Amino acid sequence: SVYLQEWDIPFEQVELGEPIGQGRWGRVHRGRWHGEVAIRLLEMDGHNQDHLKLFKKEVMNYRQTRHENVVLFMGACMNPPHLAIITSFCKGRTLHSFVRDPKTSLDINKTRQIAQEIIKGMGYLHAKGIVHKDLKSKNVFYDNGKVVITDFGLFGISGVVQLKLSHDWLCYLAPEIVREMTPGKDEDQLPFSKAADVYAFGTVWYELQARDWPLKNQAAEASIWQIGSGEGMKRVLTSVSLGKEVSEILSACWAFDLQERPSFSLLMDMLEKLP
Amino acid sequence: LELDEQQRKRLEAFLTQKQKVGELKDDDFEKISELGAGGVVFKVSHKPSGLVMARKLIHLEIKPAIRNQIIRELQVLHECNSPYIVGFYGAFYSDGEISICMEHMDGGSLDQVLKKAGRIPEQILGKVSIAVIKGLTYLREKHKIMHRDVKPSNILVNSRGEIKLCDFGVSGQLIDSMANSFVGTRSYMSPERLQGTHYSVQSDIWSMGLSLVEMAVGRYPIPPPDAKELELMPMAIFELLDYIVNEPPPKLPSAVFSLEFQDFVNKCLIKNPAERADLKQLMVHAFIKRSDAEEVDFAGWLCSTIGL
Ligand SMILES: CNS(=O)(=O)Nc1cccc(-n2c(=O)n(C3CC3)c(=O)c3c(Nc4ccc(I)cc4F)n(C)c(=O)c(C)c32)c1
Ligand SMILES: Nc1ncnc2c1ncn2[C@@H]1O[C@H](COP(=O)(O)OP(=O)(O)NP(=O)(O)O)[C@@H](O)[C@H]1O
Numbered sequence: 110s111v112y113l114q115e116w117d118i119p120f121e122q123v124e125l126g127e128p129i130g131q132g133r134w135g136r137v138h139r140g141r142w143h144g145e146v147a148i149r150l151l152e153m154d155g156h157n158q159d160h161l162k163l164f165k166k167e168v169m170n171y172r173q174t175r176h177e178n179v180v181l182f183m184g185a186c187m188n189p190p191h192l193a194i195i196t197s198f199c200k201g202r203t204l205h206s207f208v209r210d211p212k213t214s215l216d217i218n219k220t221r222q223i224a225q226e227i228i229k230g231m232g233y234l235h236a237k238g239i240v241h242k243d244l245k246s247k248n249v250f251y252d253n254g255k256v257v258i259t260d261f262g263l264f265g266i267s268g269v270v271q272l273k274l275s276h277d278w279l280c281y282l283a284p285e286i287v288r289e290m291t292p293g294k295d296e297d298q299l300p301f302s303k304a305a306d307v308y309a310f311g312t313v314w315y316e317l318q319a320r321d322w323p324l325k326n327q328a329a330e331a332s333i334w335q336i337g338s339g340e341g342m343k344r345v346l347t348s349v350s351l352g353k354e355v356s357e358i359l360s361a362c363w364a365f366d367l368q369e370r371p372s373f374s375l376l377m378d379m380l381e382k383l384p
Numbered sequence: 385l386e387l388d389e390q391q392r393k394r395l396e397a398f399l400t401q402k403q404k405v406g407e408l409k410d411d412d413f414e415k416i417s418e419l420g421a422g423g424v425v426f427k428v429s430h431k432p433s434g435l436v437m438a439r440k441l442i443h444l445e446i447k448p449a450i451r452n453q454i455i456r457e458l459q460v461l462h463e464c465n466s467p468y469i470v471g472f473y474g475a476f477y478s479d480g481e482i483s484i485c486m487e488h489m490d491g492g493s494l495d496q497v498l499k500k501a502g503r504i505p506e507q508i509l510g511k512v513s514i515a516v517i518k519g520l521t522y523l524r525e526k527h528k529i530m531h532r533d534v535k536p537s538n539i540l541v542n543s544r545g546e547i548k549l550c551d552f553g554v555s556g557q558l559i560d561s562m563a564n565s566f567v568g569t570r571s572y573m574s575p576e577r578l579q580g581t582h583y584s585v586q587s588d589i590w591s592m593g594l595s596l597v598e599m600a601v602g603r604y605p606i607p608p609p610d611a612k613e614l615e616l617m618p619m620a621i622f623e624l625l626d627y628i629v630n631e632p633p634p635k636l637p638s639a640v641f642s643l644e645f646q647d648f649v650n651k652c653l654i655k656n657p658a659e660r661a662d663l664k665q666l667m668v669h670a671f672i673k674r675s676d677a678e679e680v681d682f683a684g685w686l687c688s689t690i691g692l
């Protein structure tokens with residue numbers, strides 16, 4: 110049990126507002142801290158089966174964080190089995206709905222600056238030993254220049270919620286994870302790592318170029334083999350050329366051998382030596 | 385086609401009963417029992433009209449504007465009617481889920497039949513093949529549609545002895561609009577389809593072949609049993625899928641089954657779809673010719689092995 114009086118942020122009141130989406134990690138509400146916040150509501154079947162112990166650890170880990178490109182983690186109150194995670198509210202559009210808007214005009218400069226911001230945020234997280242499981246274009250927000258990353262480290266939690274997969278998610282999943290995928294296995298068991306995150310950045314980098322995800326919607330099984338074999342990403346890399354400098358980092362991030370994938374500090378330099 | 389006259393008879397007797405309802409709503413139906421989990425299908429009673437239907441439940445939370453596109457594509461299904469196609473009663477939207485009420489086939493799926501019987505004999509499996517082949521030809525020749533999801537759980541039987549296909553791919557918008565598909569432990573998808581390349585009805589032909597081997601031997605045949613395991617008679621999904629793409633396809637044992645049956649499935653499971661038999665070639669295979677001319681009271685076998 111951890112309460113709101115243990116937190117950096119001074120707490121007096123918090124009013125729920127309208128929800129803005131449900132997922133397998135609870136429900137997200139537009140809230141009001143005199144500032145709007147995002148409140149994620151969870152339930153933990155883990156009746157003190159180290160879940161809370163881990164939760165206290167991971168939540169305290171989220172504490173001591175602040176960066177202009179990462180969401181401001183504010184609070185996490187737990188009145189078991191009911192938990193809640195309060196985050197700063199990002200105004201503006203998701204990068205997903207932003208890049209797929211026809212009227213939007215992105216170039217190699219706008220694209221470069223956007224990627225840099227994401228790496229700066231993701232670099233902070235890796236420096237703190239915080240693996241951002243679940244990085245994707247739906248969890249990145251853009252508002253007239255400001256870029257923020259969302260919902261980091263959430264998959265490390267073991268709260269209650271045939272395999273259950275989306276398509277938009279598979280394009281970000283690295284092969285090492287897809288091979289280990291099997292029914293009755295939980296998210297905690299998959300091999301997320303600093304390397305697993307940079308793979309998902311490649312699918313983001315591709316979305317910044319192609320304005321879509323790499324694999325046209327298929328039966329997830331097809332996406333499994335195409336990803337787990339590495340052949341699928343090899344085909345789409347060949348199927349359309351973009352630029353040696355651009356394709357360099359896409360082939361780099363999507364390297365099949367995880368150790369052949371660069372660190373985020375390395376990616377900062379690669380994004381500099383660009384058009 | 386090569387439609388018989390009696391086939392016209394039994395279709396028409398259903399389509400008179402068709403007009404026996406006009407509209408559908410949630411409260412018309414009473415849950416009788418649960419069939420299985422996948423969508424989930426329930427036995428239901430219709431109350432405005434004495435027809436007993438099968439109601440399958442697909443949970444979706446999506447906006448009204450897309451639904452009218454799905455429904456207008458879906459309206460074409462009222463036009464297709466065949467002794468090899470489960471009859472359809474209607475489609476509607478209600479409380480965050482599409483309910484599909486359809487013809488009840490009293491024998492269930494081939495998966496649940498196989499579990500109870502242990503093994504399915506060669507001669508029954510011959511009669512099943514003819515019904516499937518003619519259904520796919522109809523869809524190709526009259527509507528230009530492939531099934532895309534043929535497998536035992538979607539093959540239904542009844543006590544009259546009819547065999548009908550369900551869960552086929554009528555709506556292009558619904559495929560695209562379905563963001564989230566669900567995978568399990570058995571896959572019946574063809575190799576070419578699994579690699580994300582160009583595909584046709586040929587991928588359905590693989591699924592039929594592979595489905596037949598499972599039912600003939602009583603076990604999902606990937607991976608093959610070992611030498612000592614076939615006498616007596618914990619794997620990740622990608623290992624199974626990579627087996628399909630790279631290892632030789634399963635085959636029937638060579639002792640206990642006829643060459644026509646062994647050769648037929650072998651021709652269905654050729655990995656290169658250009659060499660895999662097509663419907664025209666399948667229609668003329670010796671195995672099919674024998675089964676088509678054989679006199680087997682299929683209804684009697686079904687009732688007697690399942691204990692009515
Ligand atoms: C998963 N691999 S995939 O990515 O390639 N997508 C895909 C591929 C192949 C089939 C389907 N599919 C489907 O699986 N089911 C079953 C719910 C589990 C459908 O019911 C289905 C469908 N309903 C339907 C129509 C007539 C009858 I009689 C009974 C029915 F249930 N209709 C209209 C479809 O058009 C498709 C395309 C369906 C999905
Ligand atoms: N801090 C936030 N500010 C604004 N919107 C947010 C925030 N966190 C989450 N959301 C949105 O709330 C909705 C539900 O969140 P989430 O639980 O992550 O589901 P999801 O993002 O749609 N994908 P998934 O995690 O698989 O459920 C999504 O539309 C998110 O974009």
Ligand SMILES: Nc1ncnc2c1ncn2[C@@H]1O[C@H](COP(=O)(O)OP(=O)(O)NP(=O)(O)O)[C@@H](O)[C@H]1O
Nearest residue numbers: 419420421422423424425438492493533537538551
């Ligand atoms: N119309 C039906 N009538 C009776 N039993 C059915 C019917 N459809 C499916 N079943 C059974 O209930 C289970 C659930 O089927 P369903 O939800 O339609 O998906 P599935 O048949 O398992 N394969 P799929 O439909 O492609 O996802 C199947 O495994 C069958 O055993």
Ligand SMILES: [Mg+2]
Nearest residue numbers: 247248259260
């Ligand atoms: Mg998220």
